[PDB]
Amino acid sequence: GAMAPSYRVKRMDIAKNDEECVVNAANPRGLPGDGVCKAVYKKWPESFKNSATPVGTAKTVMCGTYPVIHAVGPNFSNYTESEGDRELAAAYREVAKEVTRLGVNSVAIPLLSTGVYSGGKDRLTQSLNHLFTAMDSTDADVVIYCRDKEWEKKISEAIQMRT
Ligand SMILES: CN(C)C(=O)Cn1ncc2ccccc21
Ligand SMILES: [Cl-]
Ligand SMILES: [Cl-]
Numbered sequence: 001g002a003m004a005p006s007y008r009v010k011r012m013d014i015a016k017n018d019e020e021c022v023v024n025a026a027n028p029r030g031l032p033g034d035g036v037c038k039a040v041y042k043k044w045p046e047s048f049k050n051s052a053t054p055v056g057t058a059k060t061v062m063c064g065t066y067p068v069i070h071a072v073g074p075n076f077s078n079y080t081e082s083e084g085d086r087e088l089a090a091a092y093r094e095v096a097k098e099v100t101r102l103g104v105n106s107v108a109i110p111l112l113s114t115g116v117y118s119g120g121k122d123r124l125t126q127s128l129n130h131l132f133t134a135m136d137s138t139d140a141d142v143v144i145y146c147r148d149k150e151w152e153k154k155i156s157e158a159i160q161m162r163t
Pocket of ligand 3: 147148
């Protein structure tokens with residue numbers, strides 16, 4: 001575990017992370033995809049061997065010895081708000097199980113279902129709160145990776161408000 005488990009946020013490409021493993025915002029079919037998923041495919045293409053997994057699950061595939069945790073958030077274009085919210089919570093619970101199983105001291109994680117799976121809604125708070133619900137009982141250092149400068153400030157504020 002980390003000596004003093006923390007949350008941090010950085011505004012940069014998660015393919016350049018400084019953590020012991022990465023969470024991919026994957027699609028259910030193990031396809032290269034776009035956004036975080038395409039960056040992850042470029043950096044760790046070997047981790048897409050048999051990475052297909054259903055919505056609300058996570059499946060880990062090693063790229064060398066570096067673990068890529070493929071976490072499949074719901075696409076809110078297809079799910080109801082209620083069912084989508086349940087599957088988004090479940091994907092992060094499966095990430096916490098994998099992070100624990102791997103024995104890593106740190107993990108790089110994007111906000112699931114906030115980009116092309118958001119169904120055109122701002123889900124920063126919904127996705128981040130489900131991330132915290134899952135990860136709070138883990139002792140890994142968590143580093144959240146984002147793109148938007150306003151999102152960086154809001155995630156940083158949310159982390160600080162609990163400390
Ligand atoms: C400037 N460049 C090369 C990019 O926009 C690449 N990139 N990809 C993800 C990401 C997150 C924050 C900042 C830059 C990011
Ligand atoms: Cl997304
Ligand atoms: Cl963002």
